[PDB]
Structures are given as C-alpha cells and as structure tokens.
Nucleic acid binder design. Structure first.
Length: 849
DNA sequence: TGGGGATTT
C-alpha cells in the first residue's frame, strides 16, 4: 500500500463541521411514499387489474364523431384534390394487398409485413387500417401508433402521410419524438414516434390501453428498443386480447420474427427500386487494373476461391487478390483510382464512398483535393467532394443533398451513416469498402474497444440499394466473393453489447421484477453475466437493496429519461444547488457533445476546447461553459457568428438546452426543486463553487477513477482504479496537459483503440471522493493514520478529520434516504440545509488560491 | 495525439 496526500482538515473547520452536524441532528406530505409501498406490495396479477381500471379512455367512443368522419371520408374521396393522391397511392405495391391485410389483422392478433424499401408499407399500412375503421363507422375507437428507430424518419414520414390526406400536419397524422411533438388529434389518428418514446410511456400505461394498433417498423435492424419491445409484447398480449400488433421488417432474417410470434401470418410485399449491379474485387480490378506498390490465412480463404474462377478472370488479376491489402480499404489510392475511373466512363451520376471511419475519410478527401498523381490533378476541379460523418457539419447543411455544379460530379466520402441515417437522392454509384467500426465490450476484462471489422451480408445489401433511387446504378464492393461467404448474416443484435442498468431498473416499473428470467425471453438473450453486472451497479448506487428490491431512490431514477448514474447526479445537483452545470454534464454525456470535428482543423479544435474549458480541467464543465457561452450569444444576436467561430452545432446545443429543462421539470414535478427552470437562482446558489461541482460530477461517475503519477505537450503515467495503464484521449481537454492541481480523475467512458483512453474526464479531489464514495475506512498502516476510498486509494488523515468525515458520511446517507422517500426541496434556512453547508465547507478547502 | 451508428411520457 502507498499513502497518498494528506486530507486532514484544520481544527477551526472541523469545529464548524461538528457544529453544523449537531444542528442537523436536532430535527424531528408524502404521496410519493405511499406509491412506493403500493408498488412493492402488489403482485403482477393485481398490477394487471389496477392498470386496466386506471387507463380506460379507449373504453369510450364518440358515435356522433364516428359518423361525422365517416361522411367526410366518402365526400373527400370524390373531390379532385384527393383521388390524384389516391391514384398515385395505388401505384404502391402495398396498396395491392390492402384487403388481405385488413382481414389478416381481423383474424390474428399479431401479423408481420416484410417488404423492401419502396414498398410503401410504412406510409400505406397505417392509412389502410385507419380509413377502414372510419368507413365501418368505428373512427373514434381507432388509435394507431407506429414506431420508427430514427427521429428524422418519424417526422418526414408524418409530413408525407399528412400530404397524402390533404391535411396540415396534426389533424389525422402526427409525430411525437423526445421534446418535439406535432400531436395528432386524440381519436381516429395515426402517430409516428421513436421507439424510445413508447418505452418511457409504458410506465404510465404498462399494458397499452391507450392505443388500439401498434405498428413496429424496421425491427430487422434489431435496435435494443424493438427487441426489448417485442419481449414485452409477450408479457402484455395475453392481457390485451383486443390490441392489434403489426410487425414490419426488411428481408433480413425476417423468419426470426415470424418464428418468434409462434407461427404468425407473414406478408411479403415487393419493392420498387432501379436495378443495381453488384461487382466484387475480381470485377473491379478487371476494369481499372490498378497496380499496388509502395496473418495469412489471407491465403486459406483466397486460393480455394481463385481456383474456382481460373477460367473466368485474367491471371494477373487473380494475383492481386493474393495481396492482403487488395480487399477492404488498406490502399486508399486504390479507392482514389476507382473514383477517377468512374468520373471518365460510366456516365453521369454521383459517387457514394463507404469508409469505416474519420481517419480513412480524411485520407481519401486529401487525395481527391490534393492529388499527387497526374490523373488526380486532372479531375480535382471537376469533383465536389463531401465528407459525411456524425461529427462533421456536412450533414447539417443543404449542399451535399443538392445536385453538383455544372461540369462537376458529386463524390460523397462517408461512414455507415449514409446507409440508413442519411439519404442522398442522386447517388448512382456506391463504392462499398466492406469495413466499418464497432464498439465491443468484453465482459471478462471490463474493456470496451473500438475496432475495424467487416460488414455483414445485410449491410452490403443496404449499401447496394442506396444506388437504385434515381436511375439504375452500380455498386463496387472492394472484397472478393470468398470474403462475402465468410461474412455474417446480420450485425450482432445491439442488446448484447449494451449496458443493462437502465433496462433492469425500468423493468421494475412494469412489475417485471426478475431481469434474468425476463431478459432470457428476448429474441437474442443477453449474457446472464452481463445482467448480474448491471444489478450490482444498481445495488452499488443504492437503487436496489441487497435483496434486489427497488429502493425509494431507485424508483425516482427509473422514471428519468437518463441512465441511473447520471440520474443520481442530477438528483444530487438539486439537493446541492448546482442544477444548471450538472444537468449540462448529464445532458451532454447522455446525448453527445455539441462540438464538430471538421477536416484539417484538429489543431484548431483543440484550441477551441482549451478556451472553453477555462482551465477547469474537466471535459464536462467545459460543455457547460460552452452552453453559458451559447446563451450569451443568443442574448447578443451573435448566435451564428459564435457557432461559426467555435465549431458548434446550434442544433445539438438547442437540444441539449431542451434536455436540461426536461430534467428540471421532472425534478420539479417530483418535488426536488422549487422551480421548473434549470437556471432559477434558488436551484443554483452553488453553481459557481467549482470544487462543489467536481464533487457532484464524481458522485455521478464514481467509481470510475484514475490516478496520474507523471509530469513532463506532456506525457502521463496514469492508471485506473483497476490497475490498468491509461491516457487521456486526444479529443479530451486533458490530453497532453501538464500541471494539475489534483492527481485524481473521474471518467464516463474508457475505450481502447491504440491505447486505453478515457474519452472524457474531470479532475476531482480526494476529500470529495471520500465523502460521496464507498469503501471508506480509517486506520493505521504505516505509523501514519489513513482514510481510504474504494478500499483502493489510501490518504494521510489525522484521527480528528477521519472521525468527522465518517460521521459526516452517516448523516449524509441518512438525509439522502429521507429525501427520496419524502421528496421536498431543501429549505434555505432549515435543518437539512446545515448538513449541506457542512459539506460545502469541507469541499472548499480545495479551492484554487 | 485521435472520434462506427442510433435514442428516452
């Protein structure tokens, strides 16, 4: 054991801490408490009873409305604004099956509709069931909810379906996504929503009494939410026999969903695209004849294949397939030569380049912009080259979606983002490198890694279709057919990669009290060892007790649209009067950073973040400083100027602002804040006390700690609490920095690409870790008294400061327990506020001088 | 000295 630095406090301070604690200890309406006992007392049978009576709105129909809408429907089908809209709808394949679909829903609780992009299942099925019920005189009984995986898709589909019905958005078609909703009318309506919206809504309506038809779309993508939703349908559907569910899928292991719902009926609806020809690595080199010059088990795969095609391809070509670097994107000048080829031959259309990541997109971009070869300079002024990456601005501007200038061809250099998320309509040529990146958690080593991996058969299929929108196109796949046969069918279902704390907690609100038993009933069951790991995290932050039962704090966390750790952090910030900065840290960690990463500018990006961090050595306070800056720029009408200067997405920021308020209102409704405003003065008296913020940030990120032992840009000898050597990720504001006032850091994410990096970090001080952490004991190991945290970091501390900090931690735990059970804001002049002031005072001993 | 991609009454 090595003894860290001294944390003994001055006698004068300890004497005041003792005084405040004794004031706290001389103190003697909770609707929330009875709800919490009522949840624990009922079994699932009773919960099912209770929820039926409480959500009865659909037991009521409006016959005067049923008839009124039935009349207006027939009438508007003979007008000449519609019935052009109907005749163009009738060219969509789905509409040929309308009547079989209507009947299939009538006779079966669950059906599946499987169809290719272009088939119109998403826009046409909901309209088919709605217009049916209206005509039959049931309009007011019909409320259709259609999920989508992506926010942008949910909206545009809504605007489109609303167009096909001659309505402004919000009469019969609407959308609801997080913090933005154009709600449709109450009854006889179709609502598009993100799958997550529906999940949070389950708490209030656990058995889906507030809808008549659930349509799950794009379930073949296996997002956690669709897979999670389907498992929940097996628990719900035996108790909702009048509910109708329609599953929807691409032709990507569609049979898995049909098998899952026990043998249910399955429609196959044909798609409407232009034919796209698939070429593979043998065919690409055959046309461009590019020359390469500058384990194997490349050979185990490639030679058996080269033998089967000896008579179909030239012998010089087949030799290049022996080169390990011919496939994938190892040689970028190979892809560059494939673009220059298309620019000459293969007449006009745009080129869509699929590259794995930021690094390789930069390489191809510089080559197409700064060519070293004659062929490249010939073409440079004739390409309009757009990089496409979630961290790059090009997606949030209208240039990459419009047609290129005259005499120029549009070339898009993209990640997998352009596969489904982003759509460019004039793409005719797709170059498919076959390589993407994936984050993989290894449960055995507690290491998350970011690796370059092969794409799956489903992916390649999706990138092909991207070329069949305007006219028949070509897709160039830079791998051999011997590779495709060795590629997987689909990507790993993402639920097997995801942290389970959120789900395990959210399940408790649905009275699904055994996460091991329930999660095993999913399409792909997550590793039970990963389930246990989640329960311990929840027991460690005291949201579950040792018996696994929900705790009062745990019920609060489960209701919040954020991970339980950052939910706790937000809660602490309400009790400690730093609501505004902390909810910036929580909102940013959950959603994303507001910062772009434009090509070439990586040095200037580092400088913008150095300045925004204000030497506070915390990535999270840095974002809050940015938001404080953003608000000021809205006050001065410099909003655009400010964002241009600091590489900021106004869209990201505005949505971070919206999340801060959602947290504030929830905390307000739960009786933890006096005001629903995250800026209110009362919620924020401590918001300028930087040592205090670091304490609450650490309470959120604990026990993810790091210790730095080296000084030199600067080199760092730094290791996490598990012992492994790490560095600050270069995108972090602590990379290469020297002269820290403390040697201990907290982090949200640790990830290995070239070394073990902390993607994000906040420097914290020992006394705050000790107060809000666990594994705290006082003793003697040298002839020195110590005070430790996590039983991992042992600090020099005299017996007077230890006995106080231990007694302090008790009263803190006693308070947190009471506030969760009996939520009420901390009054400014009460007993509770004194214990707070005691903690502020001990934490300020670390203030910068 | 480096950042696959969604999302939450």
């Amino acid at each position: 054991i090595r003894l860290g630095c001294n944390v003994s406090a001055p006698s004068g301070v300890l004497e005041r801490v003792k005084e405040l604690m004794e004031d706290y200890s001389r103190a003697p309406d909770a609707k929330f408490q009875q709800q919490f006992r009522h949840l624990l007392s009922v079994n699932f049978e009773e919960f099912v009873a209770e929820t039926k009576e409480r959500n009865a709105d659909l037991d009521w129909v409006n016959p005067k409305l049923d008839e009124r809408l039935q009349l207006e429907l027939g009438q508007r089908q003979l007008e000449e604004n519609a019935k052009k809209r109907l005749e163009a709808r009738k060219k969509l394949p789905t509409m040929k099956y309308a009547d079989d679909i209507i009947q299939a829903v009538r006779e079966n609780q669950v059906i599946l509709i499987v169809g290719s992009t272009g088939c119109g299942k998403t826009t046409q099925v909901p309209q088919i069931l709605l217009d049916d019920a209206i005509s039959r005189g049931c309009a007011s009984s019909c409320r259709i909810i259609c999920t989508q995986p992506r926010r942008i898709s949910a909206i545009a589909i809504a605007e489109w379906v609303s167009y096909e019905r001659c309505e402004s958005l919000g009469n019969s078609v609407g959308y609801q996504i997080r913090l933005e909703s154009r709600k449709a009318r109450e009854r006889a309506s179709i609502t598009y929503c993100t799958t997550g919206v529906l999940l949070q809504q389950l708490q209030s309506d656990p058995l889906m009494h507030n809808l008549s038809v659930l349509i799950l779309d794009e379930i073949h993508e296996r997002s956690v939410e669709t897979d999670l939703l389907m498992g929940l349908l097996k628990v719900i559907l035996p108790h909702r026999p009048d509910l109708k569910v329609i599953l929807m899928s691409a032709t990507v292991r569609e049979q898995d969903f049909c098998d899952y719902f026990n043998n249910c009926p399955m429609f196959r609806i044909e798609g409407v695209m232009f034919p796209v020809k698939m070429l593979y690595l043998e065919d690409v080199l055959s046309k461009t004849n590019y020359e390469f010059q500058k384990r194997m088990k490349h050979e185990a795969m490639i030679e058996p294949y080269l033998r089967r095609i000896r008579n179909s391809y030239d012998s010089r070509v087949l030799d290049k397939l022996r080169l390990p670097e011919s496939e994938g994107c190892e040689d970028i000048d190979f892809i560059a030569d494939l673009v220059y080829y298309i620019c000459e031959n293969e007449p006009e259309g745009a080129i869509l380049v699929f590259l794995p990541g930021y690094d390789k997109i930069s390489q191809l971009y510089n080559i197409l912009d700064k060519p070293k070869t004659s062929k490249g300079q010939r073409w440079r002024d004739h390409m309009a080259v757009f990089p496409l990456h979630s961290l790059m601005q090009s997606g949030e501007q209208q240039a990459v979606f419009r047609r290129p200038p005259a005499g120029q061809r549009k070339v898009i250099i993209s990640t997998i983002i352009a596969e489904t998320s982003v759509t460019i309509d004039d793409v005719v040529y797709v170059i498919n490198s076959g390589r993407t990146k994936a984050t993989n958690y290894d449960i055995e080593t507690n290491i998350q890694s970011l690796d370059e991996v092969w794409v799956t058969k489903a992916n390649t299929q999706q990138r092909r279709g991207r070329a069949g929108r305007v006219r028949p196109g070509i897709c160039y796949n830079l791998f051999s057919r011997a590779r495709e046969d060795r590629m997987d069918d689909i990507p790993t279902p993402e639920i097997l990669r995801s942290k389970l704390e959120s789900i395990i907690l959210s399940l408790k609100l649905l009275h699904i009290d055994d996460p091991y038993r329930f999660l095993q009933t999913l399409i792909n069951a997550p590793n039970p060892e990963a389930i246990k790991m989640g329960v311990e995290l929840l027991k460690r932050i005291e949201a579950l007790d040792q018996t696994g039962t929900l705790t009062p704090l745990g019920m609060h966390l489960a209701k919040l649209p954020i991970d339980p750790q950052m939910g706790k952090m937000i809660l602490m910030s309400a009790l400690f009067c730093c609501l505004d900065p902390i909810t910036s840290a929580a909102a940013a960690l959950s959603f994303k950073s507001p910062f772009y990463s434009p090509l070439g500018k990586e040095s200037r990006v580092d400088e913008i973040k150095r300045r925004m961090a204000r030497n506070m050595r915390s990535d999270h306070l840095m974002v809050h400083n940015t938001i404080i800056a953003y608000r000021d720029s809205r006050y001065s009408h410099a909003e655009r100027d400010f964002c241009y200067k600091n590489f900021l997405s106004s869209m990201t920021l505005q949505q971070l602002e919206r999340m801060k308020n959602q947290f504030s209102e929830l905390l307000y409704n739960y009786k933890f804040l006096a005001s629903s405003n995250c800026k209110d003065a009362a919620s924020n008296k401590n918001s300028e006390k930087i040592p205090l913020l670091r304490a609450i940030i650490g309470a959120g990120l604990y026990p993810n700690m790091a210790h730095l032992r080296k000084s030199r840009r600067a080199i760092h000898t730094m290791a996490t609490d598990d012992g492994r050597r790490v560095n600050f990720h270069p995108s972090s504001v602590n990379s290469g920095e020297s002269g820290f006032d403390s040697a201990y850091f907290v982090y949200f994410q640790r990830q290995k690409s070239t070394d073990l990096f902390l993607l994000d970090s906040t420097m914290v001080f020992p006394m705050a870790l000790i107060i809000f952490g666990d594994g705290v004991e006082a003793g003697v190991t040298q002839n020195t008294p110590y005070l430790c945290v996590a039983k991992t970091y042992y600090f020099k501390c005299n017996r007077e400061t230890a006995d106080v900090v231990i007694q302090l931690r008790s009263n803190l735990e006693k308070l947190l327990l009471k506030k969760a059970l009996y939520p009420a804001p901390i009054e400014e002049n009460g007993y509770e506020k004194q214990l707070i002031k005691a903690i502020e005072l001990l934490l300020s001993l670390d203030e910068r001088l």
